[PDB]
Amino acid sequence: GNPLVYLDVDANGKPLGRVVLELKADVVPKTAENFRALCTGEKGFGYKGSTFHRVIPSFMCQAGDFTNHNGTGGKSIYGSRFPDENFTLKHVGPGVLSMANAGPNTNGSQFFICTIKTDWLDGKHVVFGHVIEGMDVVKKIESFGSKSGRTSKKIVITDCGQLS
Ligand SMILES: Nc1cccc2cccnc12
Ligand SMILES: Nc1cccc2cccnc12
């Protein structure tokens, strides 16, 4: 079936717990595969040791810039960027996993987990999964955000990988 992957997250050197994500490879196989391999680190790079750099309460938690660590960077397993696979999955509510981008067809490695229904991103951001377990951790991360997106704690993906 669809891969299950995990992110173990620290805030200020203290463990918050684990976020488990289902990657909808059945709908967006290319997008799912990229995120899966970046969790395992099997291509020589990935999410391990990178941060949630932009968090906005009542909106979303963003991460995945493992090259520049500031929201300008990241890269995919295919190359620096890859196309929007489709917009079939919708931003239906809290727990939705979606690709951050800098406009059409600029997917790399940055992603976000929604804390509300972000329906206005439908057709603009590629949704590729959702939170199976660990919304409690996501709400903690959300609480360390701000209006500007600047985080009030240093939030780090200490470990990540594939469960199935
Ligand atoms: N099937 C699901 C279970 C729990 C949360 C979800 C969030 C978005 C899409 N699907 C979801
Ligand atoms: N892939 C990306 C996602 C979100 C923001 C970005 C900003 C600059 C370059 N790439 C970006």
Side-chain angles (χ1 to χ4, degrees):
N2 281 337
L4 291 190
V5 295
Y6 71 93
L7 309 175
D8 289 330
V9 186
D10 270 18
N12 288 343
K14 290 277 177 61
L16 302 177
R18 171 169 291 184
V19 181
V20 177
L21 301 161
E22 180 185 349
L23 309 181
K24 292 290 186 181
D26 56 334
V27 184
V28 283
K30 298 172 181 57
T31 306
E33 176 59 16
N34 178 60
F35 194 94
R36 185 203 62 78
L38 291 174
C39 285
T40 69
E42 71 197 56
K43 312 299 182 170
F45 55 87
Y47 297 130
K48 182 167 175 91
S50 67
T51 69
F52 282 78
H53 66 273
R54 169 180 184 221
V55 176
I56 299 169
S58 301
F59 179 21
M60 57 89 199
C61 310
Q62 189 173 331
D65 186 353
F66 58 79
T67 62
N68 296 354
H69 303 281
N70 62 21
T72 62
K75 66 182 169 174
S76 83
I77 66 174
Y78 308 118
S80 66
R81 301 285 178 267
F82 66 104
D84 300 319
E85 192 162 13
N86 58 66
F87 300 109
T88 303
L89 287 159
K90 307 298 171 185
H91 294 82
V92 294
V96 166
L97 175 63
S98 188
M99 289 301 292
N101 64 47
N105 304 302
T106 61
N107 302 284
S109 54
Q110 291 184 59
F111 65 93
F112 61 97
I113 303 176
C114 304
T115 56
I116 61 161
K117 177 175 157 187
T118 65
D119 67 337
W120 68 94
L121 302 180
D122 290 350
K124 291 178 174 298
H125 295 259
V126 174
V127 176
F128 66 100
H130 71 270
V131 175
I132 292 292
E133 179 200 309
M135 274 302 292
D136 64 315
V137 178
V138 172
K139 298 298 288 180
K140 288 295 294 181
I141 293 167
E142 182 188 24
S143 76
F144 309 148
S146 77
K147 286 200 285 163
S148 74
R150 174 65 207 255
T151 56
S152 62
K153 298 197 179 186
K154 182 168 184 180
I155 309 163
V156 182
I157 301 170
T158 60
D159 309 80
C160 49
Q162 182 166 15
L163 300 174
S164 65

